[PDB]
Design a protein around this ligand. Sequence first.
Ligand SMILES: NC(=O)c1ccc[n+]([C@@H]2O[C@H](COP(=O)([O-])OP(=O)(O)OC[C@H]3O[C@@H](n4cnc5c(N)ncnc54)[C@H](OP(=O)(O)O)[C@@H]3O)[C@@H](O)[C@H]2O)c1
Ligand SMILES: [Fe+3]
Length: 359
Amino acid sequence: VWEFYMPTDVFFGEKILEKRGNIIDLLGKRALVVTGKSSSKKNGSLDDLKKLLDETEISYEIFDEVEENPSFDNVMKAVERYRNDSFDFVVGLGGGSPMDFAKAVAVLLKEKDLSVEDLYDREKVKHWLPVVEIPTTAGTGSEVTPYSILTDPEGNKRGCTLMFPVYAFLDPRYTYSMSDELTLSTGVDALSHAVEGYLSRKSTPPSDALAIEAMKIIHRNLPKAIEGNREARKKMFVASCLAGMVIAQTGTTLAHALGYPLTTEKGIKHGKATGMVLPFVMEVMKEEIPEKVDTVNHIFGGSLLKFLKELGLYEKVAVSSEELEKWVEKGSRAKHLKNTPGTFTPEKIRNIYREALGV
Ligand SMILES: NC(=O)c1ccc[n+]([C@@H]2O[C@H](COP(=O)([O-])OP(=O)(O)OC[C@H]3O[C@@H](n4cnc5c(N)ncnc54)[C@H](OP(=O)(O)O)[C@@H]3O)[C@@H](O)[C@H]2O)c1
Ligand SMILES: [Fe+3]
C-alpha cells in the first residue's frame, strides 16, 4: 500500500504575502508569531507579516526568541508566556527552528494540560491551533511537513509528528539574505530530504516524482545559489519545498538520525551534518537498492559524494572514542532504521562516522 497526503495550501512568489496572504483571515482574529532573534528583521519578512496582519485586522504578539535547534525549555518559555492568552492561530516565520517551534506551540496552547514530552505520544495530540508557515531558508521544507524537531533536556534532537500547516507562504526574496554558508547547509538539507525520501523503504510514486525533480533542480542550482545568484536561489527554494513534500510522505532515514549528535555536540548545522554522512549511509543501502542509489549518483553528476566534497561540505571534526561509541549506540536504536534499506550493524554505523568525519 502507498498513501499520499499533503494538505497544506502552498503559495509561492515574490510579494506572496501581499498577493495571497489575506486568506489567513479565515483562521481568526488573533495570532501568535514565533520567529528567531534577528534574521526576519533584516530580510523584510517580519515587516511584510506585520503589514499583512494589520491589513487583515488580526491582532498579534511576537515571540522573537526562538533559538536554533530549539530545546524543550525554549518551547516551555513560550508556552508559559502565552497559554493565558487566546490565539486563534500561530505563524512560524524563519527557518526550520521557528517553523517547528510554531507547530509545537500550536498544539500546547490548545492542549493546556500537555507537556512537551507528551507531543511524542501520538494518542495525546488530538487538537491544535492552525499553523501558518513562512519559510526563509532553502531549506527544511517544514512549511509542508507535520514534523517538529526539538532538543530534549538530555541533549538529544528528537522529532515528533504533529499537524500539517494550513497555509505555507514562500517568498524567495527572503532567502537572498542567507550567507553563503547557510545557503550551503540549508541546500544540503533539502538535498538530503529529496535523496532520503527517494531511497526510503516508504518511497511512493508521487514522492519519487517530486524527489527526482528536486534532486535535478538542486544539482543544477546549488553551486550558483551559494555564490548568491538570485535565480538559483529561487530554484533552491522551490526544491526545498518539493523535498519537504517528499519527506511528508516518506519520513527520513538513518542519515538524518546520525547527523543529530553532530549538530548538538559538534556545532555542525543540521543540513551539513546529514549531508556529510548521507553518501556513506547510501553505500550500505546499495545492498538492497543498488539501482536507486545509482540513479541518485547519476543525477548528481556521477557521484553525490564528489558533488558534496566539491562544495566544501567536509571539515575536520574532532571525535573521541567515547563520543563515537555513544553515537554508534544511539544510531543503532534509531526509529529511522526500519525505513532505511540495508543492514546497519554497530560496525557499519561506526564506519559511516569514521569515513564522514575523517577519523
Ligand atoms: N520539520 C522538519 O520536517 C525538519 C526537517 C529538517 C530539519 N528540521 C530542523 O530545522 C532546524 C534547522 O532549520 P534551518 O536550517 O532553516 O535553520 P534555523 O535553525 O531556523 O536558522 C539557522 C540560522 O539562520 C538564520 N536565518 C534564517 N533565515 C535567514 C535568512 N533568510 N537570512 C539570513 N539568516 C537567516 C537564523 O537567524 P535568526 O535566528 O536570527 O532568525 C539562524 O541563525 C533544525 O532544528 C532541524 O532539525 C526540521
Ligand atoms: Fe532535515
